Design a protein around this ligand. Structure first.
Ligand SMILES: *[C@@H]1O[C@H](CO)[C@@H](O)[C@H](O)[C@H]1NC(C)=O
Lengths: 361, 469
C-alpha cells in the first residue's frame, strides 16, 4: 500500500504522514514519521488496495479530556489529569471507500533529524473500520466492522477498561444505539433496536500494546435505520471516532400475469399483461421496459401497445411495490412462439436488469 | 495576580519566605488540564483573599519537570502545603475559593483560638460548625495544657477556642476550668440542649477527644461534605431531602424535627443507631446505592447503612406524622426488614428451559442446596452473549428431564450479583454444586453446546440425564 499520505492540517496547511524523502514543501512540523507500536495504522494501509485512489486525510490538534457523557465517567474515577499525557497531540482522520480510520498521535517537540528534516510522531490510539459504506439487504442483519489498538504510556496489569459507543446521526440529532465499558461494571444506556456489539480486547497480555474489537451487530435492518453511524472508542482522556454510511437495499422480484397465454386467432388482442415488481428498495430509479422477444424482428424489439404504471405500494418494512401494464396489439401469426416480457431496471440490479416473459400462441 | 509563579529555577529558594505560619500552598499543574483550567479562577480568588496570611503558588509542570518529579506529581491539579520549605501533606479540600481560604486560615494556626472579649466569643460560636471552648482563669493550669494538646491533635476536625475573660470563665464554670461544646445555633432544637459541658473529674487530652466525638453531633446532625467522614461508618440512618439552611431553613427544620421526634423515642428506649439529615443534591451520588429516586419532590427519603454494609430502605412514604418512620425503625430493630438489592421484578412465569434469575430470587434458585446450578451472567449489549443465547437455551432443553440440574441466566447489569460470585466480563458462567453453595466454580471451558454437556457429565453431583436426539 501507500508509503506516504498527503494530509491537510486544520484549526488549511499541507502536511503528510510517512508510513526519509525530503520535503521542503512541508513544514516539517506537519511532516510525520509514524511509529505505530500497536500496528493498526500501518496494517490498515499495508492491505490498502493497489492503485486505489489516495485516501482523504485531515490532521488537527487534539487535547486529552474526559469523555463528556456521564455513562463513561467510570473510565476517569480520579479527579485529575494523568501526567503521562503531557505533550502535544494530533488527531488524524482518514477516509476512503476502502476504510475510515482515526488516530491519536504524539509528535516530538522539534522536527530536527540527522538524515532528513522530519518530525517523529507516535501512534497511541487507532480506531478503524473496514466497512465505511456498508450495503445491507433489507430485513437482513448488518455487521458494522470496528477494530482498535492502544499503546499505553511506557512510563507507567492487563489491558485497561475502555468505552465503546455507537450512534446513528441525522441533522445534528444523534441517537445512541449502544454503549459499553467492558472491564468496568457500570450503568450503561439502554441498547436500542436490538443491537449488540463484540466489544473486547483481542487478548489480555501483561503489558501491551493491545488490539480490540467493537463491531456493531444491527438485526433485521429496515430503511429507517439507513444513514450515518458514528462509532467512538474511549480510553481515559482519549477518544477516537469513525463514520460509517449505511445504505439499505432490496432488488425487486419480477413476475408476469397471466403467467401463460392460451392460443389465439390472428387479429385478436391478448389479455392485459401485468408485470409485478415486488418488494424493492429504494423506491426511485425503477424503470419498466416492455419487449417482444423472438419475433419477426430480432429476439429483442420494443413491444407495442398501451402501457402504464400503477402508483407505488408501500409496505411496513419500508420496501415498495409497483405494477407495469401492457395491452398488446392484435396478435399476428408471425408472432406465434414469440414472448412478451418486461425488463426491469433498478440500481440494486445487474446491468441487464431482471425480466419475466410469457409466450404467445 | 497574587499567585506566585515558581519554577525549577526559584522554587527551593522562594518556597521558604512564607508569611507568618511558614505555610505556602503550591498548585502543580499543566495548562492543558481541564480540572486545572476550572480551578484557575478560584485559585486566583483564594490567593488574593489570603494575601498576608498564607501565600499561594503554582508550578507549570510541563515547563518544570524537575520540581514536579521531585514532589512526585502524577496528576493535575496537585495541591500541596509546604511548611518552612518542606512537604506537609496534600490539601484535602474542595477546589473552591471558600474551601481553600477557610482550610488554610485554620491551618495557619493556632490550634485553639484565644478569645479576648465577649464580642470575639459571641462571634466564634456563631459559626455553622460546632465550637469547643475551653475556659481557664489560671495561666499555668495543667487542664488548659491538656486542652491545647487536644486542640493540636484534633484541630483537623474541630474548631477550638479558649478564654480567660472574667465574665466568660465565670458564666461557664465554677472551678475556673471547664470545656463547653456549642452546637450550631441554627440546629438548636427542643429535643436536646444546645451546649454540653465536660464533666469528667480530671481533664486529659484523651478524655477530651472522647468527649468531643461523643457529643458534637447530638441525636441528629446535618451531614455535609465537610463532616461526612465523621458521621458515616457506623450504623446510620440518613433522611435525604432539600436540606439547605441558607435558602430553605424552614423546610430544613420542618423535616429534621420530625426525624428527631421519632429518633429520640427509640434512642431513649435504649436502641442503638445514629441519625443524620443530608441534602438530596449534595449526596445525590449516594442515592443510587439505596435505589432511591432523587425527585424534586421535597418529601424526604430514608435509608440505613449498617457499619457492616447492610442497606435498609424505607419503602413507605414519609408521613408528616412520623408514624411511617417509626414503623420502619420498629421493623429495623426487630429484624423485620429485608436488606436492599438492585433487582429486576421476579418474572410472572419462570418455567424453563432456562431459569431466569434476578437478584430477588437468586438465593432461592441458585442456592437451593439440593441442586447443581449452572448460571450464566450476561449483559444486554454483549454480542458473544447473543450467540450463546440459543445454544444455552438448547442446553436447558436437553437437561429439562434431569431433576438435579438447573440451567439459569441473569442479566448481571440489571441485578446486584451476590458476594460469592465475581462478574469479570461477559459472559461469566459459574457452576454451583449441590453442596458447595459457598464455593461455586467459574466455568472456563468452551461455549459450544457440546462443551457444556461434556462439562456437566464430568461435574454433575448425580449422574446427569441428558435428553439425546
Ligand atoms: C470482531 O468480532 C466478530 C465476532 O466475534 C468477528 O467475527 C470479527 O471477525 C472480529 N473482527 C475483528 C476486528 O477481529
Amino acid at each position: 500500500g501507500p508509503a506516504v499520505i498527503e494530509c491537510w492540517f486544520v484549526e488549511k496547511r499541507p502536511g503528510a504522514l510517512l508510513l526519509p524523502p525530503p520535503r521542503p514543501d512541508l513544514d516539517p512540523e506537519l511532516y510525520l514519521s509514524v511509529h505505530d507500536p500497536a500496528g493498526a495504522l500501518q496494517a490498515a494501509f499495508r492491505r490498502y488496495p493497489r492503485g486505489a485512489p489516495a485516501p482523504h486525510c485531515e490532521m488537527s490538534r487534539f487535547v486529552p479530556l474526559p469523555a463528556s457523557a456521564k455513562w463513561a465517567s467510570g473510565l476517569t474515577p480520579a479527579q485529575n489529569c494523568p501526567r503521562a499525557l503531557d505533550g502535544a497531540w494530533l488527531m488524524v482522520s482518514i477516509s476512503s471507500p476502502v476504510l475510515s480510520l482515526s488516530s491519536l498521535l504524539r509528535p516530538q517537540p522539534e522536527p530536527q533529524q540527522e538524515p532528513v528534516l522530519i518530525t517523529m510522531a507516535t501512534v497511541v490510539l487507532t480506531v478503524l473500520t473496514h466497512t465505511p459504506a456498508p450495503r445491507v439487504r433489507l430485513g437482513q442483519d448488518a455487521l458494522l466492522d470496528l477494530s482498535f489498538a492502544y499503546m499505553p504510556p511506557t512510563s507507567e496489569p492487563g489491558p485497561p477498561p475502555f468505552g465503546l459507543e455507537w450512534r446513528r446521526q441525522h441533522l445534528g440529532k444523534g441517537h445512541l444505539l449502544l454503549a459499553a465499558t467492558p472491564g468496568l461494571n457500570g450503568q450503561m444506556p439502554a441498547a436500542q433496536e436490538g443491537a449488540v456489539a463484540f466489544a473486547a480486547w483481542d487478548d489480555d497480555e501483561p503489558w501491551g500494546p493491545w488490539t480490540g474489537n467493537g463491531t456493531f451487530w444491527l438485526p433485521r435492518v429496515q430503511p429507517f435505520q439507513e444513514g450515518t453511524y458514528l462509532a467512538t472508542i474511549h480510553l481515559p482522556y482519549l477518544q477516537g471516532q469513525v463514520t460509517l454510511e449505511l445504505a439499505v437495499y432490496k432488488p425487486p422480484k419480477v413476475s408476469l400475469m397471466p403467467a401463460t397465454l392460451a392460443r389465439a386467432a390472428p387479429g385478436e388482442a391478448p389479455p392485459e399483461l401485468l408485470c409485478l415488481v415486488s418488494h424493492f428498495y429504494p423506491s426511485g430509479g425503477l424503470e419498466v421496459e416492455w419487449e417482444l422477444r423472438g419475433g419477426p424482428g430480432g429476439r429483442s424489439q420494443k413491444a407495442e401497445g398501451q402501457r402504464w404504471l400503477s402508483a407505488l405500494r408501500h409496505h411496513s418494512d419500508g420496501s415498495v411495490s409497483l405494477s407495469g401494464h401492457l395491452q398488446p396489439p392484435p396478435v399476428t401469426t408471425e408472432q406465434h412462439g414469440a414472448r412478451y416480457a418486461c425488463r426491469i431496471h433498478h440500481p440494486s440490479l445487474p446491468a441487464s436488469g431482471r425480466s419475466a416473459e410469457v409466450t404467445l400462441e | 495576580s497574587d499567585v506566585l509563579e515558581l519554577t525549577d529555577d526559584n522554587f527551593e529558594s522562594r518556597i521558604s519566605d512564607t508569611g507568618s505560619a511558614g505555610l505556602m500552598l503550591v498548585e502543580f499543574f499543566a495548562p492543558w488540564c481541564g480540572h486545572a483550567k476550572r480551578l484557575a479562577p478560584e485559585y486566583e480568588a483564594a490567593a488574593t483573599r489570603l494575601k498576608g496570611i498564607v501565600p499561594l503558588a503554582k508550578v507549570d509542570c510541563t515547563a518544570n519537570t524537575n520540581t514536579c518529579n521531585k514532589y512526585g506529581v502524577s496528576g493535575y491539579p496537585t495541591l500541596k502545603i509546604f511548611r518552612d520549605g518542606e512537604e506537609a501533606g496534600a490539601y484535602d479540600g474542595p477546589r473552591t475559593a471558600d474551601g481553600i481560604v477557610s482550610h488554610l486560615k485554620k491551618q495557619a494556626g493556632p490550634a485553639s483560638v484565644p478569645l479576648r472579649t465577649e464580642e470575639e466569643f459571641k462571634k466564634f460560636i456563631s459559626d455553622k460548625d460546632a465550637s469547643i471552648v475551653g475556659f481557664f482563669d489560671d495561666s499555668f493550669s495543667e487542664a488548659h495544657s491538656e486542652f491545647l494538646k487536644a486542640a493540636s491533635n484534633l484541630r483537623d476536625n474541630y474548631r477550638f477556642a479558649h478564654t480567660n475573660v472574667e465574665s466568660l470563665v465565670n458564666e461557664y464554670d465554677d472551678n475556673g476550668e471547664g470545656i463547653i461544646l456549642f452546637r450550631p445555633s441554627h440546629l438548636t432544637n427542643k429535643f436536646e440542649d444546645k451546649t454540653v459541658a465536660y464533666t469528667e473529674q480530671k481533664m486529659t487530652s484523651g478524655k477530651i477527644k472522647k468527649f468531643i466525638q461523643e457529643n458534637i453531633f447530638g441525636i441528629c446532625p446535618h451531614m455535609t461534605e465537610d463532616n461526612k467522614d465523621l458521621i458515616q461508618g457506623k450504623d446510620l440512618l440518613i433522611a435525604y431531602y432539600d436540606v439547605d439552611y441558607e435558602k430553605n431553613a424552614k423546610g430544613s427544620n420542618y423535616w429534621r424535627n420530625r426525624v428527631m421526634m421519632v429518633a429520640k423515642k427509640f434512642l431513649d428506649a435504649g436502641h442503638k443507631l445514629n441519625f443524620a439529615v443530608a441534602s438530596r443534591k449534595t449526596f445525590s451520588h449516594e442515592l443510587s446505592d439505596f435505589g432511591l429516586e432523587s425527585t424534586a419532590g421535597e418529601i424526604p427519603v430514608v435509608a440505613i447503612r449498617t457499619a457492616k454494609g447492610e442497606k435498609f430502605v424505607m419503602q413507605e412514604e414519609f408521613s408528616r406524622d412520623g408514624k411511617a418512620l417509626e414503623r420502619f425503625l420498629q421493623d429495623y430493630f426487630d429484624g423485620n426488614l429485608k436488606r436492599y438489592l438492585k433487582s429486576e421484578p421476579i418474572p410472572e412465569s419462570n418455567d424453563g428451559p432456562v431459569k431466569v434469575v434476578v437478584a430477588e430470587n437468586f438465593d432461592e434458585i441458585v442456592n437451593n442446596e439440593n441442586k447443581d446450578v449452572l448460571i450464566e451472567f450476561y449483559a444486554p449489549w454483549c454480542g458473544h452473549c447473543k450467540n450463546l443465547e440459543p445454544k444455552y437455551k438448547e442446553l436447558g432443553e436437553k437437561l429439562s428431564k434431569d431433576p438435579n440440574i438447573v440451567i439459569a441466566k441473569m442479566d448481571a447489569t440489571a441485578n446486584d450479583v451476590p458476594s460469592p460470585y465475581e462478574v469479570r466480563g461477559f459472559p461469566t458462567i459459574y457452576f454451583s454444586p449441590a453442596n458447595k453453595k459457598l464455593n461455586p466454580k467459574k466455568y472456563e471451558g468452551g461455549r459450544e453446546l457440546s462443551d457444556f454437556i461434556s462439562y456437566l457429565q464430568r461435574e454433575a453431583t448425580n449422574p446427569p440425564v441428558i435428553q439425546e436426539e
